Design a protein around this ligand. Structure first.
Ligand SMILES: *[C@@H]1O[C@H](CO)[C@@H](O[C@@H]2O[C@H](CO)[C@@H](O)[C@H](O)[C@H]2NC(C)=O)[C@H](O)[C@H]1NC(C)=O
Ligand code: NAG
Lengths: 123, 49, 107, 98
């Protein structure tokens, strides 16, 4: 079915980097399809991080996150990689990757798909 | 090139399959969503090169 | 650079009643790049209305979008006891996107 | 009647054919002109036609052909009725060959 799977919660240590990924079930990254990342902390408002274009390779980042996060996509494996450096206690939260049902170079403006999210905590 | 020659381009999206020997030079933004877009790049429409 | 304010902050209405929520933007006016989301505790947020003029996959006719100006409004016809969740307005048309704070409905 | 315009939108974003064979020769241009609302080559005070508003196209950025060939049989001045000239052309494009 049209569903997205993601890795489980993780615990890490200060002074280290984290690579985060989420996969799909039969969904293809292709070119038109684009996926964004969101983060949710304990009882905190949702914050936008970045979205990337698999085909053109264009990326968007937040001004606050312009120095210690990288987002990349691989159509062949249809995977998304986030490299995060210097994860503090404020960076311990749940990550979600979302993409629309974007096939046959046509798709609406709503992101129906929603991953379970990864609870990343660094002490 | 050592620095990287980026002056070779190729079209990525087109609304239809071109007929034999066709060429196209238009660089207008290609829309994906039903709602029309204009102006510059953004969501659901991009640069076709 | 866009801040959305969601009102009212809290609600407590009898189930099955009609409810309406609004959200406030300060940047340029756009009506087809706004989306409404609900996040349940322990689950990822789910999309309800996209573009303020169309429904998503499997969304019942309960949620109706409105608004033409900078204000953005949504209406729920009946408050079935599972509809209690949080509401988020999200815009797309501007420099980096930002959500709202969240409107919580209580029994 | 002098020439023809061929294209798909004619709004300076897609290439277009201009065929004009007014007096000197036949000019054929493959180019993305910026066509005006009402192109003409006739209006000039007061009742005699003249080659006015020749620049019906306002721009030509980058484009392919510049062809020239001998003109056709014309008529001098303006005579209304008693037509002795019947011209008939057929245009057809196949595999780019116009
Ligand atoms: C040549 O130009 C015409 C006109 O733009 C193209 O016709 C379009 O075809 C698509 C098919 O997917 C339709 O959805 C559009 O509505 C058509 N345009 C119009 C204005 O109706 C045609 O596809 C072009 N040919 C090539 C090979 O690109
Ligand atoms: C060189 C070139 O452009 N050739 C194309 C031709 O193949 C096509 O059949 C025709 C109509 O689409 O347009 C022209």
């Amino acid at each position: 079915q049209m569903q997205l799977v993601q890795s489980g919660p993780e615990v890490k240590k200060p002074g280290t980097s984290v690579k985060v990924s989420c996969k799909a079930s039969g969904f293809t990254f292709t070119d038109v399809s684009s996926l964004q990342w969101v983060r949710q902390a304990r009882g905190q408002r949702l914050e936008w991080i970045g979205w990337t274009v698999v085909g053109t390779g264009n990326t968007n980042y937040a001004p606050r996150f312009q120095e210690r996060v990288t987002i990349t996509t691989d159509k062949s494996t249809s995977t998304a990689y986030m490299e995060l450096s210097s994860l503090r206690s404020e960076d311990t939260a749940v990550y979600y990757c979302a993409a629309p049902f974007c096939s046959e170079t046509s798709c609406s403006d709503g992101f129906d798909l929603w991953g379970q999210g990864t609870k990343v905590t660094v002490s | 090139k050592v620095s990287g020659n980026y002056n070779y381009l190729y079209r990525l999206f087109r609304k239809s399959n071109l007929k034999p020997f066709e060429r196209d030079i238009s660089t207008e933004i290609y829309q994906a969503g039903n709602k029309p877009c204009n102006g510059v790049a953004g969501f659901n429409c991009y640069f076709p090169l | 650079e866009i801040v959305l304010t969601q009102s009212p902050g809290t609600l407590s209405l009898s189930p099955g009643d009609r409810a309406t929520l609004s959200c406030r933007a300060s940047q340029s006016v756009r009506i087809s790049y706004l989306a409404w989301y609900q996040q349940k505790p322990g689950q990822a947020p789910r999309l309800l209305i996209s573009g303020s003029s169309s429904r998503a996959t499997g969304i019942p006719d309960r949620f109706s979008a409105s608004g033409s100006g900078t204000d953005f409004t949504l209406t729920i016809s009946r408050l079935e006891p599972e509809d209690f969740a949080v509401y988020y307005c999200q815009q797309y048309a501007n420099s980096p996107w930002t959500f709202g704070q969240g409107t919580k409905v209580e029994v | 009647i002098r020439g023809w315009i061929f294209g798909t939108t004619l709004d300076s974003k897609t290439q277009s054919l201009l065929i004009v064979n007014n007096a000197t020769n036949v000019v054929i241009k493959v180019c993305e002109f910026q066509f005006c609302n009402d192109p003409f080559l006739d209006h000039k005070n007061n009742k005699s036609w003249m080659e006015s508003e020749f620049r019906v196209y306002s721009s030509a950025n980058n484009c392919t052909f510049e062809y020239v060939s001998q003109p056709f049989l014309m008529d001098l001045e303006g005579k209304q009725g008693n037509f002795k000239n019947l011209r008939e052309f057929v245009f057809k494009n196949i595999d780019g060959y116009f």
